[PDB]
C-alpha cells in the first residue's frame, strides 16, 4: 500500500535520469527546482552532471497549482530542466513549464523521480512509475503527523520531539 | 505633426485620469505591478496619488525587430512575493500591441490573485489588446520624457528640448567607451 | 520654508549628475535604485547615459534603515551606482552601499539629487544642497495628505479625488 | 582515515540533533534561510522534522583559492520577502571558516528580524566563527552525499560507492561538452 524509497533508491533515481539526459544529448544549462519537493533531487542531479546553475520556483498545489514566487534571472537562449520529486496529476510540471516558456529559453524539458499511472501530462524524464502512495525521506514526518501508523524508521524519536514541540503552543 | 511629445504636465493629467477612473470603477488595487522599465514612473506617480504603498515589478521586454524571436514578449525576472487573494493593477506607459500587458496579465494570474486589471497611459488604435484603464488614444510616435534620449540616439532629427546639451554629453561619452 | 522643484529642475539635476559621472570617468555597469524615491531619478539617468541595466532595493527608514527585499542578480566585478532622490541623514545610502559591497562589485558609488547640510555620510555625486523641506513631484500628494496647506499645483483636483477615496472605507 | 564520509543515516541524526537542540533552547524559527546550495538539503529535512513551512534562500559563495578576491564570501542573490519581527534560522552544511554564516547573519540583520540564529551540521575546530547549533565537530575533510561527485572529479582516489558507474557517465559527458 505504501512505497517508501530508501536514500539508496533515490540516488538510483537520480543516476537513471542523469544517464537518460546524457544519452538524449540534453545537458541542461539551468536547473529549475520545484519548491520544495524538487529541492533534493535537483541538488543531487546537479552534483552528478556538474550543473553549477540552479534556480527555483515556489509553486503549491491546492483546485489548480499556484505560484507564490519565481526565483530566477534571465533564461533566454538556455536549455532548462524543471525538476520535481513526483508527478501525480502532472499539472504542477505543466504549470512550471508554461511560465518558464515565457522566459524564451532554448528549450524546456521536465523531470520527476516517480510518475503516477494516470497523469495528464507525462514528464520527459523519469525513473519509475509507482501505483502506491509514496513516502519520500524528506516528507516522512509530514506523513507521520497525518498518520503515525505508517511503517517508517525512527518514529519513536520523532514523537518524543513532536510532543515537546506541542508543549509550547 | 509626426511625433507626440507629452509634457510632464500631460503625464500628470494622464495619471490623474487613471486614478479617477479607478475610483469610479471602485477598483482600489492592493498591489501595483510596474512594467519595467517604461511603466515604473507612471506606477510611482499613481502610487503617490492614491496612497498605494505596495509596489511590485516585472522585468519584461518586447523586441519587435525582425526577427530571431518568434515575436512574444520575453520575461527576464519577476520581482514579487505572494499575490494570492490580492487585487492587482498592472501599469505600463504605452500599449502599442497590447502584447506585453497580455503576457504580464497571464503570469500574474498564475499567482491566483483576487483580480488582475491592466492600465497604460496611452493606447494605439491598432492595439490588438486593450488595457482596462487608459488616458488617451494616440495614433503617432510617442516620445516620453523618460526615453527621449533613447529616441534622440536613434533619430537625431527629433524636436526635443535640451538636445544640444545632451549631444555634447553624448560625444564625451562615446569618446571613453 | 519649502523647496518644491519643478520637473524642469529635476531634469537639470539628472544632467548635472550625468556630466559629473562622465567627467569622473565612472560609467556604471549597473544602477541600483532605492525604492521608491530613487525610482524616477534612476530611470532618467539611465535614459541619459544609455544604461540598460537597472536593479532595485526595497529599503525603508524608520531608528535605523530596514531592508525588505533585494532585487538583483550577481554584481561581481561590476561598477555600481546607487541612486536615491534625497540624502537627509545619509544613513540609507550608507546601508545600501554596505549591502551592495557584499556582492563583491568592482566599485560602489552613491548618488542623490539633493543633499542635506549636516548628513553623516556625503554622497559621491549630487546636484545641489538644500536647507529646506523638499517636496518632490512624485511625493507631493504624500505631503498634502499630511498638510493640505502646502503651496502645490492641482491641489483642488486631488482633494476631490481624495474625498471619494475616503467614501469607500 | 583521511576523509569523513557521513551516511544518509548520519545526516538524519545530524538533523535530529539540531531540531532537538532547538526545542531545548525554545527557539522555533518562523523562517528557515538555506545557504545555497550546500545547506538546502539540511534545511529541507529540518523543515520536515519541525513542520517549518516557510523556507527562504540566499545564493552566497566562498572561493578560498588564491586569490583574486580579498577573501570574503560573495553574495550573488538574496531570495526573500520581509523578515521584520521574524525569528530566523540560517542553515548550512559545514562551518569551515564560519565566514559564510557570518556574512549571511550580517545581511539578514539588516532586514530587522526579531532574531537571527545560525546552524550547521558540522564544525571544524579551527573555525573562527561558531554556529549556534551544530551536530558534531569534525577535524577531517567531509564528503557530503550531495557533493561526493564534485570531490570525485577533483580527486579520483576517494573511497565512495557507485564511483565506477559515475566515471562511465562522466566519460560519456565529457565526450559531448
XYZ file of C-alpha atoms in Angstrom:
692
model
C 0.000 0.000 0.000
C 2.986 2.262 0.663
C 6.153 2.742 -1.353
C 8.886 4.062 0.922
C 12.074 4.556 -1.127
C 15.428 4.364 0.638
C 18.098 7.005 0.050
C 19.896 4.294 -1.921
C 16.938 4.135 -4.313
C 16.701 7.929 -4.564
C 20.313 8.012 -5.748
C 19.486 5.307 -8.293
C 16.621 7.503 -9.482
C 18.991 10.441 -9.949
C 21.514 8.256 -11.792
C 18.878 6.928 -14.193
C 17.614 10.413 -15.039
C 21.188 11.640 -15.410
C 22.153 8.878 -17.829
C 18.908 9.377 -19.763
C 19.846 13.037 -20.245
C 23.393 12.318 -21.428
C 22.204 9.684 -23.905
C 19.495 12.056 -25.160
C 22.167 14.720 -25.712
C 20.350 17.184 -23.461
C 22.759 18.780 -20.995
C 20.791 21.492 -19.133
C 22.302 24.956 -18.730
C 19.909 25.716 -15.872
C 18.025 23.574 -13.357
C 14.662 24.854 -12.147
C 13.838 23.240 -8.815
C 10.209 22.968 -7.739
C 9.908 24.048 -4.110
C 10.116 22.167 -2.037
C 9.841 18.581 -3.261
C 12.298 19.139 -6.092
C 14.923 20.649 -3.786
C 16.810 17.437 -3.032
C 16.575 15.752 -6.454
C 17.767 18.930 -8.218
C 20.802 19.248 -5.942
C 21.773 15.598 -6.421
C 21.332 15.796 -10.192
C 23.401 18.983 -10.134
C 26.300 17.252 -8.384
C 26.123 14.259 -10.724
C 26.233 16.125 -14.040
C 28.244 19.095 -12.724
C 25.442 21.624 -13.260
C 26.510 24.818 -11.489
C 23.363 26.862 -12.133
C 20.221 26.092 -10.132
C 17.167 28.341 -9.912
C 13.910 27.841 -8.026
C 10.141 28.325 -8.142
C 7.685 28.473 -5.238
C 4.552 26.753 -6.525
C 1.878 24.998 -4.463
C -0.924 22.629 -5.467
C -4.329 23.258 -3.888
C -8.031 23.145 -7.446
C -5.137 24.483 -9.525
C -1.411 24.996 -8.851
C -0.446 28.430 -7.515
C 2.819 30.331 -7.953
C 3.952 32.218 -4.852
C 7.276 33.468 -6.225
C 9.774 32.863 -9.031
C 13.464 32.821 -8.101
C 15.371 33.197 -11.372
C 17.148 35.631 -13.674
C 17.212 35.660 -17.483
C 16.757 32.228 -19.069
C 16.833 33.394 -22.688
C 18.500 31.024 -25.144
C 19.202 28.406 -22.485
C 18.364 24.723 -22.108
C 16.212 24.374 -18.997
C 15.329 21.303 -16.937
C 12.469 21.501 -14.441
C 12.877 19.025 -11.583
C 10.271 17.782 -9.107
C 10.125 14.618 -6.983
C 6.804 13.091 -8.065
C 4.323 13.791 -10.858
C 0.847 12.851 -9.636
C -1.638 14.797 -11.751
C 1.214 16.301 -13.753
C -0.371 19.746 -13.552
C 2.456 21.220 -11.464
C 5.179 20.424 -14.002
C 2.904 21.674 -16.781
C 2.300 24.973 -14.986
C 6.028 25.449 -14.376
C 6.844 24.564 -17.984
C 4.217 27.113 -19.022
C 5.748 30.009 -17.082
C 9.368 29.125 -17.917
C 8.448 29.184 -21.617
C 7.617 32.876 -21.176
C 11.318 33.409 -20.413
C 12.122 32.484 -24.031
C 14.567 29.674 -23.279
C 16.114 27.486 -25.977
C 14.162 24.526 -24.611
C 12.203 23.434 -21.544
C 12.107 19.783 -20.548
C 10.600 18.323 -17.389
C 11.698 15.589 -14.997
C 10.460 13.747 -11.914
C 11.738 10.847 -9.815
C 8.469 8.914 -9.903
C 5.386 9.039 -12.125
C 1.748 8.237 -11.370
C -0.098 5.957 -13.868
C -2.922 8.264 -14.990
C -1.226 11.671 -15.162
C -2.481 14.144 -17.763
C 0.977 15.276 -18.862
C 3.884 12.823 -18.732
C 7.357 14.193 -17.854
C 10.186 13.971 -20.396
C 12.455 12.120 -17.963
C 11.634 9.855 -15.021
C 12.903 6.825 -13.106
C 9.914 4.610 -12.287
C 6.115 4.549 -12.296
C 4.586 3.610 -8.937
C 0.943 2.771 -8.197
C 1.323 3.267 -4.440
C 1.378 6.248 -2.088
C 4.988 7.417 -1.978
C 6.678 8.448 1.265
C 9.895 10.310 0.454
C 12.641 10.616 3.081
C 12.200 14.409 3.037
C 8.477 14.367 3.840
C 8.190 11.299 6.069
C 7.431 13.327 9.199
C 4.739 15.128 7.236
C 3.019 11.767 6.769
C 3.560 10.601 10.356
C 1.880 13.804 11.544
C -1.157 12.839 9.456
C -0.879 9.162 10.407
C 1.686 7.809 12.870
C 0.881 4.221 11.870
C 2.986 4.369 8.702
C 5.917 1.900 8.708
C 8.911 4.265 8.837
C 12.129 4.217 10.869
C 12.993 6.462 13.828
C 9.304 7.107 14.509
C 9.754 6.891 18.287
C 12.500 9.527 18.360
C 10.243 11.848 16.362
C 7.151 11.509 18.555
C 9.189 12.387 21.643
C 10.406 15.530 19.887
C 6.912 16.054 18.469
C 5.322 16.106 21.929
C 7.786 18.638 23.348
C 7.015 20.816 20.324
C 3.308 20.816 21.197
C 4.104 21.618 24.836
C 4.848 25.195 23.784
C 1.664 26.261 21.989
C 2.967 66.724 -36.867
C 4.665 63.320 -36.642
C 5.681 62.697 -33.038
C 3.572 63.211 -29.938
C 5.825 64.627 -27.229
C 3.786 64.824 -23.996
C 4.867 67.321 -21.348
C 5.369 66.315 -17.717
C 2.144 68.255 -17.193
C 0.253 65.960 -19.576
C 1.774 62.925 -17.854
C 0.370 64.094 -14.515
C -3.085 64.564 -16.039
C -2.693 61.133 -17.627
C -2.064 59.655 -14.185
C -4.965 61.610 -12.685
C -7.361 60.305 -15.334
C -6.448 56.717 -14.471
C -6.771 57.304 -10.733
C -10.141 58.979 -11.226
C -11.283 56.116 -13.457
C -10.158 53.646 -10.787
C -12.249 55.296 -8.068
C -15.270 55.449 -10.381
C -14.944 51.720 -11.069
C -14.401 51.059 -7.351
C -11.123 49.266 -8.023
C -8.505 50.234 -5.450
C -5.502 47.931 -6.057
C -3.834 46.129 -3.158
C -0.659 45.852 -5.234
C 0.762 47.924 -8.086
C 2.801 45.917 -10.583
C 5.038 48.119 -12.710
C 6.224 47.046 -16.144
C 9.980 47.598 -16.184
C 11.072 49.996 -17.139
C 8.609 52.097 -19.124
C 5.853 51.919 -16.530
C 7.904 52.469 -13.380
C 7.310 56.237 -13.485
C 3.537 56.052 -14.056
C 3.303 53.430 -11.288
C 5.197 55.623 -8.818
C 3.076 58.682 -9.613
C -0.202 56.756 -9.438
C 1.010 55.226 -6.175
C 1.532 58.666 -4.659
C -1.835 59.883 -5.947
C -3.937 57.059 -4.500
C -1.695 56.317 -1.497
C -0.891 52.798 -2.717
C 2.053 51.630 -0.619
C 2.723 48.195 -2.116
C 4.543 48.251 -5.448
C 5.974 45.204 -7.206
C 7.775 44.866 -10.528
C 8.277 42.639 -13.557
C 11.248 42.774 -15.926
C 9.694 42.070 -19.318
C 10.897 43.182 -22.750
C 9.466 43.055 -26.274
C 11.821 43.179 -29.257
C 9.769 43.954 -32.362
C 12.779 43.838 -34.687
C 12.985 41.118 -37.337
C 13.278 38.640 -36.016
C 15.133 35.822 -34.267
C 12.482 35.711 -31.537
C 9.089 34.408 -32.760
C 7.517 37.664 -31.555
C 6.315 37.190 -27.938
C 7.371 39.465 -25.056
C 10.237 37.987 -23.021
C 10.209 37.822 -19.223
C 13.656 38.203 -17.664
C 12.639 38.314 -13.991
C 9.600 38.666 -11.724
C 10.059 40.690 -8.530
C 7.179 39.858 -6.181
C 6.044 37.824 -3.192
C 2.648 36.110 -2.948
C -0.273 37.832 -4.675
C -2.974 35.351 -3.675
C -6.296 36.991 -2.826
C -4.912 40.397 -3.779
C -6.379 42.968 -6.159
C -3.649 43.720 -8.693
C -3.137 46.570 -11.158
C -0.531 46.299 -13.916
C 0.982 49.562 -15.152
C 2.856 50.312 -18.370
C 3.334 53.572 -20.285
C 2.050 52.679 -23.762
C 0.059 49.800 -25.241
C 1.393 49.552 -28.793
C 0.447 45.938 -29.497
C -1.035 45.224 -26.077
C 1.058 42.063 -26.091
C 3.278 42.958 -23.128
C 0.318 43.699 -20.857
C -1.149 40.463 -22.203
C 1.957 38.494 -21.234
C 2.138 40.085 -17.781
C -1.562 39.518 -17.076
C -1.114 35.827 -17.887
C 1.759 35.123 -15.489
C 0.196 37.172 -12.677
C -2.999 35.116 -12.978
C -0.931 32.049 -12.064
C -0.289 33.720 -8.698
C -4.025 33.240 -8.112
C -4.848 36.833 -7.177
C -8.372 38.039 -6.403
C -8.262 40.048 -9.629
C -5.842 41.447 -12.208
C -6.548 44.610 -14.173
C -4.269 46.415 -16.620
C -3.505 50.089 -17.195
C -1.431 52.109 -19.653
C -1.128 55.856 -20.195
C -1.574 55.724 -23.964
C -3.274 53.406 -26.439
C -2.722 52.823 -30.151
C -5.836 52.323 -32.320
C -4.248 49.230 -33.865
C -3.510 47.689 -30.468
C -4.963 44.177 -30.615
C -5.332 44.004 -26.836
C -6.901 46.902 -24.939
C -5.982 47.915 -21.363
C -8.783 48.257 -18.805
C -7.739 51.817 -17.981
C -6.059 54.323 -20.289
C -5.746 58.102 -20.591
C -5.746 58.870 -24.317
C -5.709 57.041 -27.647
C -2.786 58.258 -29.762
C -2.027 57.437 -33.411
C 1.512 58.836 -33.548
C 5.026 58.007 -32.337
C 5.200 58.827 -28.628
C 8.350 60.328 -27.151
C 8.088 60.006 -23.370
C 10.181 62.218 -21.073
C 11.941 59.093 -19.769
C 13.016 57.730 -23.158
C 13.567 60.904 -25.181
C 17.346 60.441 -25.216
C 16.826 56.872 -26.379
C 14.892 58.258 -29.345
C 17.450 61.015 -29.966
C 20.199 58.400 -30.237
C 18.026 56.551 -32.755
C 16.885 59.646 -34.654
C 18.760 62.927 -34.218
C 16.099 64.912 -36.092
C 13.555 64.902 -33.256
C 12.416 68.310 -31.907
C 13.149 67.902 -28.188
C 14.408 70.403 -25.608
C 17.936 70.417 -24.158
C 19.159 68.304 -27.084
C 22.297 70.375 -27.700
C 23.354 69.791 -24.094
C 22.781 66.045 -24.471
C 24.780 65.671 -27.686
C 27.833 67.270 -26.076
C 27.477 64.860 -23.163
C 26.938 62.040 -25.659
C 30.122 62.926 -27.549
C 32.149 62.893 -24.330
C 30.519 59.551 -23.540
C 31.364 57.772 -26.799
C 34.954 59.011 -26.511
C 35.502 56.777 -23.466
C 33.509 53.611 -24.201
C 10.385 77.219 4.051
C 9.615 74.772 1.242
C 11.671 73.855 -1.800
C 9.369 72.499 -4.493
C 11.457 71.563 -7.554
C 9.811 71.612 -10.973
C 10.245 68.712 -13.391
C 12.491 71.084 -15.337
C 14.803 71.297 -12.320
C 14.720 67.530 -11.759
C 15.994 67.038 -15.307
C 18.739 69.583 -14.618
C 19.653 67.549 -11.540
C 19.932 64.390 -13.639
C 22.027 66.188 -16.269
C 24.458 67.534 -13.669
C 24.965 64.112 -12.089
C 25.330 62.556 -15.533
C 28.003 65.013 -16.638
C 29.795 64.636 -13.297
C 29.987 60.881 -13.908
C 31.327 61.191 -17.459
C 33.987 63.702 -16.406
C 34.956 61.476 -13.467
C 35.352 58.555 -15.886
C 32.847 56.452 -13.951
C 30.321 54.867 -16.305
C 28.178 52.498 -14.185
C 27.522 48.963 -15.415
C 24.543 48.652 -13.070
C 22.169 51.151 -11.461
C 20.758 50.270 -8.048
C 17.555 52.221 -7.480
C 16.405 52.894 -3.927
C 12.689 52.149 -3.666
C 10.793 54.172 -4.104
C 12.313 57.653 -4.085
C 15.153 56.653 -6.385
C 12.801 55.119 -8.956
C 12.379 58.208 -11.129
C 15.926 59.616 -10.914
C 17.443 56.212 -11.774
C 15.235 55.825 -14.850
C 16.053 59.325 -16.105
C 19.780 58.852 -15.515
C 19.506 55.514 -17.313
C 17.994 57.130 -20.406
C 20.577 59.921 -20.396
C 23.722 57.783 -20.232
C 22.212 54.771 -22.034
C 22.450 52.457 -19.014
C 20.441 49.342 -19.874
C 20.818 47.529 -16.547
C 18.803 48.730 -13.553
C 18.303 46.779 -10.332
C 16.376 47.713 -7.197
C 16.343 47.547 -3.399
C 13.369 47.853 -1.043
C 14.710 49.724 1.978
C 12.732 51.867 4.422
C 13.856 54.377 7.051
C 12.133 54.177 10.439
C 15.581 54.311 14.242
C 17.619 52.560 11.545
C 17.009 51.787 7.854
C 15.410 48.406 7.131
C 15.775 46.201 4.054
C 12.556 44.489 2.972
C 13.911 42.848 -0.185
C 16.827 43.000 -2.624
C 16.010 42.801 -6.335
C 19.289 41.991 -8.086
C 21.422 39.230 -9.572
C 25.215 38.878 -9.498
C 27.076 42.192 -9.275
C 30.583 40.727 -9.125
C 33.280 42.732 -10.896
C 30.877 45.492 -11.907
C 30.794 49.252 -11.393
C 27.665 50.042 -9.389
C 25.853 53.339 -8.839
C 23.269 53.597 -6.063
C 20.648 56.257 -6.777
C 18.215 57.922 -4.373
C 16.368 61.254 -4.566
C 17.483 62.964 -1.348
C 20.134 62.251 1.281
C 18.900 63.585 4.621
C 20.768 61.691 7.332
C 22.713 59.785 4.689
C 22.172 56.518 6.547
C 20.046 54.985 3.780
C 22.719 55.330 1.092
C 25.314 54.053 3.561
C 23.226 50.979 4.373
C 22.683 50.236 0.678
C 26.375 50.745 -0.079
C 27.116 48.353 2.786
C 24.977 45.508 1.434
C 25.987 46.005 -2.216
C 29.641 45.717 -1.163
C 28.861 42.159 -0.044
C 28.160 41.376 -3.712
C 31.865 41.923 -4.462
C 31.427 44.565 -7.158
C 34.346 46.380 -8.785
C 33.185 49.600 -7.136
C 30.169 51.109 -5.384
C 29.488 54.824 -5.628
C 26.426 56.667 -4.361
C 24.310 59.486 -5.768
C 21.363 61.678 -4.798
C 19.559 64.622 -6.387
C 19.720 66.816 -3.289
C 21.835 66.771 -0.130
C 21.049 67.943 3.400
C 23.681 70.158 5.137
C 24.520 68.017 8.182
C 24.446 64.474 6.782
C 26.788 61.910 8.331
C 27.883 60.397 5.020
C 28.047 62.593 1.916
C 27.152 61.007 -1.459
C 29.783 60.772 -4.205
C 27.584 62.618 -6.705
C 24.825 65.183 -6.181
C 23.215 68.241 -7.765
C 22.506 70.766 -5.002
C 22.412 71.152 -1.223
C 19.105 72.496 0.102
C 18.337 73.704 3.634
C 14.563 73.492 3.163
C 11.966 70.723 3.274
C 11.858 69.262 -0.228
C 8.587 68.363 -1.941
C 9.326 66.170 -4.960
C 6.760 65.849 -7.763
C 6.466 62.117 -7.006
C 5.565 62.546 -3.331
C 3.600 65.803 -3.379
C 0.287 64.116 -2.565
C 2.011 62.396 0.335
C 2.717 65.842 1.785
C -0.739 67.252 1.022
C -2.246 64.315 2.919
C -0.170 65.361 5.938
C -0.792 69.066 5.320
C -3.056 70.394 2.566
C -1.775 73.942 3.104
C 1.428 73.350 1.133
C 1.717 75.550 -1.993
C 1.470 72.955 -4.782
C -0.459 72.895 -8.062
C -3.575 70.838 -8.841
C -4.412 70.572 -5.137
C -8.144 71.062 -5.737
C -8.366 68.216 -8.255
C -6.639 65.939 -5.743
C -8.882 66.724 -2.770
C -11.975 65.934 -4.836
C -10.462 62.563 -5.723
C -9.194 62.226 -2.150
C -12.689 62.599 -0.685
C -14.250 59.991 -2.979
C -11.448 57.643 -1.921
C -12.422 58.035 1.739
C -16.093 57.474 0.884
C -15.331 53.771 0.479
C -13.726 52.837 3.802
C 41.443 7.648 7.965
C 41.559 10.901 5.983
C 38.052 11.731 4.791
C 34.862 11.661 6.824
C 32.106 10.287 4.602
C 28.812 10.536 6.535
C 25.991 8.185 5.572
C 22.474 9.443 4.859
C 21.695 7.838 8.214
C 24.212 10.081 9.990
C 22.801 13.107 8.161
C 19.336 12.345 9.539
C 20.715 12.049 13.073
C 22.603 15.289 12.453
C 19.320 16.990 11.581
C 17.576 15.423 14.580
C 20.259 16.704 16.952
C 19.734 20.260 15.712
C 15.952 20.016 15.951
C 16.203 18.602 19.464
C 18.639 21.357 20.441
C 16.224 23.935 19.021
C 13.316 22.703 21.144
C 15.521 22.618 24.248
C 16.535 26.236 23.636
C 12.905 27.155 22.909
C 13.821 28.597 19.519
C 11.250 27.625 16.901
C 12.137 29.602 13.740
C 9.453 31.490 11.826
C 11.634 31.318 8.714
C 14.335 28.901 7.573
C 17.053 30.510 5.463
C 19.044 27.954 3.495
C 22.590 28.631 2.346
C 22.689 27.756 -1.347
C 23.464 25.202 -2.201
C 25.191 23.163 0.497
C 22.546 23.793 3.135
C 19.419 23.332 1.027
C 19.182 19.635 1.936
C 19.660 20.095 5.698
C 17.122 22.949 5.615
C 14.527 20.814 3.824
C 14.996 17.894 6.219
C 14.895 20.102 9.317
C 11.812 21.790 7.867
C 10.020 18.456 7.580
C 11.103 17.429 11.080
C 9.845 20.535 12.887
C 6.982 21.329 10.486
C 8.523 24.652 9.435
C 6.617 25.733 6.331
C 8.422 28.961 5.431
C 11.788 28.471 3.741
C 13.841 31.226 2.125
C 17.229 31.130 0.420
C 20.451 33.045 -0.158
C 22.883 32.458 -3.021
C 26.278 33.008 -1.412
C 29.634 31.514 -2.395
C 33.114 31.471 -0.856
C 36.141 30.896 -3.085
C 39.108 30.045 -0.866
C 41.519 29.707 -3.791
C 44.398 32.169 -4.129
C 43.303 34.713 -4.674
C 41.857 37.497 -6.819
C 39.073 38.063 -4.285
C 40.307 39.547 -0.971
C 38.782 36.550 0.823
C 35.186 37.425 1.852
C 32.150 35.316 0.889
C 30.333 36.707 -2.161
C 26.563 37.189 -2.282
C 25.075 36.644 -5.738
C 21.380 36.928 -4.847
C 19.005 37.029 -1.871
C 15.663 35.246 -2.273
C 13.314 36.516 0.443
C 10.480 38.881 1.297
C 10.288 40.896 4.528
C 11.778 39.294 7.641
C 10.919 42.073 10.089
C 9.838 40.801 13.504
C 10.534 37.221 12.444
C 12.641 34.597 14.203
C 15.178 33.404 11.637
C 17.401 30.325 11.452
C 20.245 30.140 8.932
C 21.238 26.667 7.741
C 24.431 25.493 6.052
C 26.071 22.056 5.915
C 29.574 22.763 7.243
C 31.239 25.669 9.038
C 34.835 25.504 7.815
C 35.820 29.115 8.481
C 32.434 30.237 9.776
C 32.779 33.193 7.429
C 29.815 32.361 5.187
C 27.405 32.070 8.116
C 28.983 35.296 9.355
C 28.275 37.064 6.064
C 24.704 35.757 5.893
C 23.946 36.697 9.506
C 25.084 40.256 8.781
C 22.838 40.907 5.776
C 19.817 39.242 7.403
C 20.203 41.533 10.424
C 19.615 44.475 8.077
C 16.138 43.042 7.458
C 15.490 43.889 11.117
C 14.226 40.470 12.203
C 13.252 39.641 15.786
C 16.295 37.368 15.958
C 18.811 35.556 13.756
C 20.476 32.312 14.793
C 22.822 30.121 12.761
C 23.100 26.359 12.326
C 25.433 23.971 10.516
C 25.659 20.179 10.546
C 29.411 20.035 11.112
C 32.027 22.277 12.701
C 35.790 22.498 12.233
C 37.904 23.081 15.370
C 39.755 25.887 13.586
C 36.525 27.637 12.602
C 36.932 31.236 13.762
C 33.173 31.755 13.981
C 30.990 29.171 15.717
C 27.368 28.384 14.760
C 24.712 28.498 17.486
C 23.614 24.943 16.715
C 25.745 22.118 15.332
C 25.729 18.314 15.346
C 29.374 17.241 15.543
C 32.849 18.776 15.472
C 34.933 17.140 12.737
C 38.659 17.586 12.042
C 38.775 15.881 8.639
C 37.739 16.503 5.028
C 33.980 15.982 4.791
C 32.469 14.345 1.726
C 28.724 15.002 1.826
C 26.306 12.817 -0.155
C 25.326 15.876 -2.214
C 28.849 16.855 -3.279
C 30.605 13.488 -3.491
C 30.787 13.619 -7.292
C 32.238 17.111 -7.030
C 35.018 15.654 -4.883
C 35.471 12.644 -7.179
C 36.044 14.982 -10.125
C 38.649 16.795 -8.026
C 40.242 13.662 -6.564
C 39.578 10.280 -8.173
C 41.198 8.381 -5.291
C 38.303 8.847 -2.860
C 36.634 5.674 -1.488
C 32.986 6.326 -2.385
C 30.237 3.949 -3.522
C 28.892 3.753 -7.085
C 32.023 5.501 -8.376
C 32.546 3.124 -11.307
C 29.035 3.914 -12.536
C 29.717 7.650 -12.264
C 33.007 7.581 -14.171
C 31.353 5.865 -17.136
C 28.649 8.532 -17.086
C 31.362 11.170 -16.696
C 33.258 9.859 -19.725
C 30.112 9.985 -21.861
C 29.567 13.510 -20.544
C 32.990 14.931 -21.418
C 32.698 13.416 -24.901
C 29.873 15.840 -25.741
C 30.822 19.094 -23.994
